[PDB]
Amino acid sequence: KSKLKPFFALVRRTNPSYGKLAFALALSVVTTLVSLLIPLLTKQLVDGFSMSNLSGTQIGLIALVFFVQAGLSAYATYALNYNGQKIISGLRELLWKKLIKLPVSYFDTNASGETVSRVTNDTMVVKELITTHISGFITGIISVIGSLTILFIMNWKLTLLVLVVVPLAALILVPIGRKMFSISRETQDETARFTGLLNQILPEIRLVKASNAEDVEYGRGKMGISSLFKLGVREAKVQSLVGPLISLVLMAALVAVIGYGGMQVSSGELTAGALVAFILYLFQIIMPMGQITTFFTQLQKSIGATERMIEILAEEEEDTVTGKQIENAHLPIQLDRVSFGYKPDQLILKEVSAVIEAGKVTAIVGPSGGGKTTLFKLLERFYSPTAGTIRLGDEPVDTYSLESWREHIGYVSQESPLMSGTIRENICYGLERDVTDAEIEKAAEMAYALNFIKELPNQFDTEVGERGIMLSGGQRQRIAIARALLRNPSILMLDAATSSLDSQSEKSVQQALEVLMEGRTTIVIAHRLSTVVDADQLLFVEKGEITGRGTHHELMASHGLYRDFAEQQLKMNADLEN
């Protein structure tokens, strides 16, 4: 609560803005002083400099130099802008050091398309306030206090009148402040959701063109713009209510300076020139009051923009803490009852319990929707179990720091996602070492990628492009297997890595992986049982429960379901010749 406190804390966590802004403020206050000084000099300076010829020759250069001193007020502007930029740049670094550290559950919950716009399109709203309206506020406040002291030395009562009228402006501007806050929050939310929709539509352009939904999607993208337009005009329709109201307040103050002006008109007003000058300076003060009002409305709008970004920085990332660096990684992974559900109500794993042997092939097999890839996401500690935990040699897996547990496990996903860039920026990813270009090569050959990656310009960059769309549906899986094999991992985890590639490449990659990972522990999902018949252990997973565990022969002889699960399989290939 008290939005100003968290906003200024979020700004003050961007430290190096703090230094030169003082110099900026000093230059601005001195420029404001010289602005207040110029007329008081210039009038009697005209009569004083009656001999313009002689005055301009020697002292006239002063009348030039002060002007370029006005030039050195421009510096203050640039100063602000530089410091201004640093603040928003600081903000982006904060968010980009938080977004990629939040646990994956936050990204299953919040769709990450929108948070990207939170990083890119929100802080650009914080730019305008810091860049201009802070200078506006400071010059306005100093000019107002100066004119206040002036009129105070003019009068003892009418200054009290205006200083009481000002609080009325505060209480009449508060509701517009709240409305600006609410409108800015909804507009920033709407721009975030719009960019999310558009980023989720465009990369799927093949689906749009093929389903013939160009028109429906243009409509659903137009209805998103129109909810910006209204939220981009209603806000304007509130800002217009700062123009009259402020003047309206001065109107009352005028009646005030008239009312007491009529009340004091016997003793006061004897120097009616004093009253006239009072009114003149009231005009001169109504200008900077408008400036201060613009700054307060912009502060409320900026808080309304960043009140959603002020909680992405409070989400508790979770990286290396225990530091118990893994030392063996060659132990059998034990699972004691390990139950887990993405949402807390429904359970997808109901007291699973298996023993992944060390240095052998264990195949998690089962019908779709059974909860296998979620079993790996448990086994790689993306999430954490709700029931009892995993162990290595009777030690819980929460005793080893995550950085020492993900640098030992090479995990090929069901999608085999690629990122835009080179193929040497996806075959080697995050490897702190310099790959040595004999290593990228042995890894690709162990994934049967060296054949197809030499027909193109090279390993060099067949820029895979966005989501690896410049490669096939089989070549990108081969590249993902290569990325997993490059790290020389102790525990391998293939989530159907031979899914979308043909039979020949399947046999080759199988031979290579079995030649390499002989002494290490491997866990493969086999959607078609022909590829894991030789596995050492099998885990039949159905509905989040491990129904049958054992070798292929004993399980198929003891498990009724899996036999059919194999038999139909056999039938098709047993039908191939006849």
Which residues within the stretch 412-431 sit at the binding site for a second copy (CB under 8 A)?
Answer: 413-415, 417, 419-420, 429-430
Out of 182, 199, 264, 547, the only residue in the binding site for a second copy (CB under 8 A) is 199
Q: Which residues of 315-349 are buried (b: 16+ CB within 10 A; e: fewer)?
A: eeeeeeeeeeebeebebebbbeebbbbeeeeebbb
Q: Do 10 and 307 contact (CB within 8 A), yes or no?
A: no
Which among ligand ATP, ligand RHQ, Mg ion, none contacts residue 108 (Cβ within 5 to 8 A by kind)?
ligand ATP
Q: Is 13 in the site for a second copy (CB under 8 A)?
A: no
Task: For residue 82, state whether it binds a second copy (rule: CB under 8 A).
Answer: yes
User: Of residues 247, 325, 488, 551, which one binds a second copy by CB under 8 A?
Assistant: 247
Q: Which whole-number Å values give the CA distances from 19 to 15, 23, 25, 567, in the listed order?
A: 8, 8, 11, 75
Cα distance between residue 151 and residue 168, in whole Å: 19
Using CA atoms, how far apart are residues 460 and 234, in angstroms rounded to an integer? Answer: 52
Residues 6 or more apart in contact with residue 339 via CB below 8 angstroms: 347, 349, 350, 351, 352, 385, 386, 387
Write down the least CB distance from residue 408 to ligand ATP, Å.
22
Which DSSP string corresponds to 69-84?
Answer: HHHHHHHHHHHHHHHH
Give the residue with the Cβ less far from a second copy, 4 or 108.
108
Rounded to 5°, the CA angle 551-552-554 comes to 70
Q: Any contact of residue 186 with a second copy (CB under 8 A)?
A: no
Instruction: By CB under 6 A, name the binding residues for ligand RHQ.
Output: 31, 35, 38, 67, 70, 73-74, 77, 242-243, 247, 286, 290
Site string for ligand ATP, 285-324 (x = CB under 6 A): ----------------------------------------
Of residues 385-444, which lie at the interface with Mg ion (CB under 5 A)? Answer: none
Position among 247, 322, 472, 568 found at the interface with Mg ion (CB under 5 A): 472
338-367: which residues touch ligand ATP (CB under 6 A)? 342, 348
In whole angstroms, the minimum distance from the beta carbon of 461 to ligand RHQ comes to 44
Binding to a second copy by residue 160, rule CB under 8 A?
A: no
Q: Chain-centre distance of CA 393, in angstroms?
A: 40
Residue of 429, 473, 543, 568 interacting with Mg ion (CB under 5 A): 473
Under the binding rule (CB under 6 A), the answer on residue 371 touching ligand ATP is yes
Of 156, 146, 380, the C-alpha closest to 264 is 156
Please state the closest distance from residue 274 (CB atom) to ligand RHQ, in A: 21
Count of helices and strands (H, E) across the chain? 20, 12
In 3-state terms the chain splits into helix, strand, coil percentages (rounded to 5) of: 60, 10, 30
Contact region for a second copy (CB under 8 A) — 24-32, 178-186, 216-224, 295-303?
A: 216-224
Q: How far is the CB of 1 from a second copy (least distance, A)?
A: 31
When binding is defined by CB under 6 A, the residue of 113, 388, 474, 550 that contacts ligand ATP is 474
> Least distance from C-beta 311 to a second copy, angstroms?
18
Instruction: Give the integer Cα–Cα distance in Å for 487 and 439.
Output: 10
- Chain positions 389 to 428 lying near ligand ATP, rule: CB under 6 A, are 414
* 3-state secondary structure labels for all residues of 523-560: EEECCCHHHCCCCCEEEEEECCEEEEEECHHHHHHHCH
227 belongs to the binding site for ligand ATP (CB under 6 A) = no
* Sole residue written with tokens 């990108």: 476
Of the chain, the end-to-end C-alpha distance in Å amounts to: 75
By the rule CB under 8 A, 315 interacts with a second copy: no
Q: Which does 35 bind (CB under 5 to 8 A by kind): a second copy, ligand RHQ, ligand ATP, none?
A: ligand RHQ
The set of residues, in sequence order, having a beta carbon less than 8 Å from that of 479 and lying 6+ positions away, is: 416, 418, 423, 426, 427, 447, 449, 464, 468, 471
**81 vs 414, which CB is nearer to ligand ATP?**
414
Nearer to a second copy, 323 or 394 (CB): 323
**Contact flags string 116-135 toward a second copy, x per CB under 8 A:** xx-xxx--x-----------
Query: For residue 38, how far is the Cα from the chain centroid?
Result: 48
We find the least distance from the C-beta atom of residue 452 to ligand ATP, in angstroms, to be 7
Q: At CA 24, angle to CA 18 and CA 28, rounded to 5?
A: 145
Q: Using CA of residue 366, residue 370, residue 374, residue 375, what is the dihedral sign?
A: negative
Tell me the window of 61-69, 168-176, 299-307, 436-444 that interacts with a second copy (CB under 8 A). 61-69
Which spans of this chain sit near ligand ATP (rule: CB under 6 A)?
108, 342, 348, 368-374, 414, 469-474, 500-501
